[PDB]
Amino acid sequence: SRQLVLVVVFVALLLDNMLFTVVVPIVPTFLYDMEFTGFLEEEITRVGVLFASKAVMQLLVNPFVGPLTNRIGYHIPMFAGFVIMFLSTVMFAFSGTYTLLFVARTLQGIGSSFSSVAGLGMLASVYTDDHERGRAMGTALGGLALGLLVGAPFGSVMYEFVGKSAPFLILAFLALLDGALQLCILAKGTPLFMLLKDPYILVAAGSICFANMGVAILEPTLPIWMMQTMCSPKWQLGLAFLPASVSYLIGTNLFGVLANKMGRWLCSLIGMLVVGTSLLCVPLAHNIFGLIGPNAGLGLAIGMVDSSMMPIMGHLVDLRHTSVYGSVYAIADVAFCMGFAIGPSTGGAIVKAIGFPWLMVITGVINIVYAPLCYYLRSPPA
């Protein structure tokens, strides 16, 4: 049946993004709880590397998944992803040491890569009508956005209420439901390593990566800054990230509707500028109510950048080279993985050497400087 595959891909992507969003409120609070005041400055570098682990492992593992799907079909690598995410979910709840969380994040990265590639390939293979295929991708990405929306308040809110191991056991039980649903189941062109050889696609990917880095580096160091300065309760740390998702969804909807009238490159330029301004204004708030504005602006900005830059990548891939159903997926996935691997990993050294606001100033200046480079993309030729 054509449907069930849509539901299983939905649940897999939702659970993966939920795990990514839920890991952020809990790990620094877990490190605070074990010792007992901040010993965090020694921790900051240690807390980071752990977050960039999944990005680096997914980047390493992504090229190998290509021919593996061709050799042994699509159903087999999907089953491996569910098992690996189940192992990671079980390991997260029962882990007590820092070393276990590292292997948990690495396993989550491997499972995420396998599940995403296999699920998108299976969704492409099941739908052959040539028109409902786009609707399938739209529903799947909407489910991913819904998982992003739901994940952050989940772990932070239901950590101090029903204990620590609960939000990972719930994810494990949800993953088991995904396995049962998927258990009862049943044109090559221009590879990615040559697609990154033209300046237009490189500028587009760089713009996406530099827009995403502002929220990439916010995860490891924002909760620690909150407990160090603002003196907020432990259940508001994940609640503070709701604007970054709600504004992102509102922006992507409105700007996917509206960006074609006034120009895509203008949308991307304005988006990078507002990312820079929001990241500059983030470390000025002295309470949780001060993070509502800059976070919402940053989410709206990232929505503007993504919704204005994905069609540009698609048009550039179509006009010059040959394109497939998911050529844009690989190019954008390299951007997100590159950002999540470089930003959080290098941010620990910056936070240790110099203060927190200097990292935000650096990110804002980098975004504002890279913003004028989107003029290159207006009317590309060849």
Ligand X SMILES: COC(=O)[C@H]1[C@H]2C[C@@H]3c4[nH]c5cc(OC)ccc5c4CCN3C[C@H]2C[C@@H](OC(=O)c2cc(OC)c(OC)c(OC)c2)[C@@H]1OC
Ligand Y SMILES: NCCc1c[nH]cn1
Query: How many Å from the N-terminal Cα to the C-terminal Cα in the chain?
Result: 43
Window 302 to 321, contacts with ligand Y (CB under 6 A): 302, 306
Single residue of 52, 280, 313, 337 touching a copy of itself by CB under 8 A: 280
Question: Nearest Cα to 204, choosing from 330, 326, 109, 365?
Answer: 330
Window 286 to 345, contacts with ligand X (CB under 6 A): 299, 302, 310, 328-329, 332-333, 336
101: its two tokens? 């969380």
362 binds, among a copy of itself, ligand X, ligand Y, none (CB under 5 to 8 A by kind): none
> Which CB sits closer to a copy of itself, 183 or 365?
365
> Which CB sits closer to ligand Y, 146 or 202?
146
Contact status: 144 vs ligand X (CB under 6 A): yes
Window 45 to 74, contacts with ligand Y (CB under 6 A): none
Could you give the 3-state DSSP secondary structure of residue 44? helix
Contact status: 244 vs ligand Y (CB under 6 A): yes
Stretch that binds a copy of itself, among 86-94, 123-131, 234-242, 264-272 (CB under 8 A): 264-272
All residues at 6 or more sequence positions from 89 whose CB lies less than 8 Å from its CB, including other chains: 19, 168, 171, 172, 175
Contact status: 369 vs a copy of itself (CB under 8 A): yes
Which residues precede a break in the chain, with C-to-N distance above 2.5 Å?
36, 186
Could you give the 3-state DSSP secondary structure of residue 129? coil
Chain CA centroid to CA 40, Å: 25
Reading phi first (left if > 0) and then psi (alpha if -120 to 50, else beta), residue 379 is in: left
What does the per-residue mask of binding to ligand Y show for 202-231, with x meaning CB under 6 A? Answer: ----------x--x----------------
Contact status: 284 vs a copy of itself (CB under 8 A): yes
> What is the full DSSP assignment across 161-186?
TT-SSHHHHHHHHHHHHHHHHHHS--
Residue labelled with tokens 């090229």: 63
Which positions touch ligand X (CB under 6 A)?
Answer: 17, 20-21, 24, 141, 144-145, 148, 152, 212, 215, 219, 241, 244-245, 248, 299, 302, 310, 328-329, 332-333, 336
